[PDB]
């Protein structure tokens, strides 16, 4: 019954050829050793 309603309602979808595996491949994610220190001596607790 869930499959039948999905077939009935989800009809006007984009069907764009863009695929997620190609997106991550052309714009990969890499790690860079680095740090950001936001010094604020008015806060009672430090969080890192």
């Amino acid at each position: 019954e869930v499959v039948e309603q999905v077939k009935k309602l989800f009809t006007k979808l984009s069907s764009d050829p863009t695929t997620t595996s190609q997106l991550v491949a052309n714009e990969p994610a890499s790690f860079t050793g680095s740090e950001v220190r936001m010094i604020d001596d008015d806060l009672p607790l430090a969080q890192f």
Binding site: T32, E35, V36, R37, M38, I39, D40, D41, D42
Partner: protein, 69 residues
């Protein structure tokens, strides 16, 4: 007594940067800075030494020539 500071500091890892090429980066501007700021200081250190030395050689030469028959 501790200071109370508020600032944001971003730092990059030493293993992500070139270590040595910055020594010869914009070399001409470095020399320009060193001579521009310090030429008065170098003159106040070099002129008395060289001037007093030159006079002493000038004195000794003349005194050596007056005693010569």
């Amino acid at each position: 007594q501790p200071v109370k500071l508020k600032a944001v500091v971003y730092a990059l890892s030493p293993f992500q940067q070139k270590i040595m090429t910055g020594l010869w980066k914009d070399l001409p501007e470095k020399i320009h800075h060193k001579v521009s700021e310090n030429w008065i200081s170098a003159t106040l250190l070099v002129t008395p030494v060289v001037g007093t030395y030159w006079y002493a050689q000038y004195f000794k030469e003349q005194e050596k020539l007056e005693h010569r028959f």
